[PDB]
Design a binder for this molecule. Structure first.
Ligand SMILES: [Ca+2]
Length: 161
């Protein structure tokens, strides 16, 4: 019932730890002020960028939604076109082991905003413990109409059940 789910075993396509302290862990710490950021220091990562983690909802429940909160400080090309993949935690030893994520169970286009975004998931996803990949295919520019940025940042990523 609209409640948050234990996350663990965090992974990212890339992360910045040189130019600033922005590891994947920043996206799961329940602090709006901290964010994961893609590696932009040289050699910089490119799109798509993603975060993944394990969601543990309890035995008799299923994750209903992924939530995304951008950084809150400024508008710096927030995520635009996103995709969520899901597999059963049994599918591998850890998040990082997962070699096939299947078809996106959900997509979303986010408005030009810092506000919290919710992506409801289909009930065809496995029950109980799941690995989740949140992937950013496209980003906003520095205005709505300028060319999209090549980097990504997320202050918080979470699953509800
Ligand atoms: Ca954070």
């Amino acid at each position: 019932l609209t409640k948050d789910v234990e996350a663990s075993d965090y992974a990212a396509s890339s992360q910045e730890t040189t130019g600033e302290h922005a590891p994947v862990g920043n996206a799961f710490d329940k602090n709006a002020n901290t964010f994961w950021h893609s590696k932009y220091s040289n050699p910089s990562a490119n799109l798509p960028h993603w975060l993944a983690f394990k969601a543990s909802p309890g035995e008799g429940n299923k994750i209903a939604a992924i939530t995304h909160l951008y950084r809150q400080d400024k508008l710096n090309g927030p995520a635009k076109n996103v995709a969520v993949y899901v597999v059963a935690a049994s599918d591998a030893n850890s998040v990082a082991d997962v070699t096939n994520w299947g078809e996106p169970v959900a997509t979303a286009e986010f408005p030009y905003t810092k506000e919290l975004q919710t992506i409801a998931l289909p009930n065809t996803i496995p029950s109980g413990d799941v690995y989740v990949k949140f992937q950013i295919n496209d980003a906003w520019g520095l205005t709505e109409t300028s060319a999209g940025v090549t980097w990504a940042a997320v202050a918080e990523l979470a699953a509800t059940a």
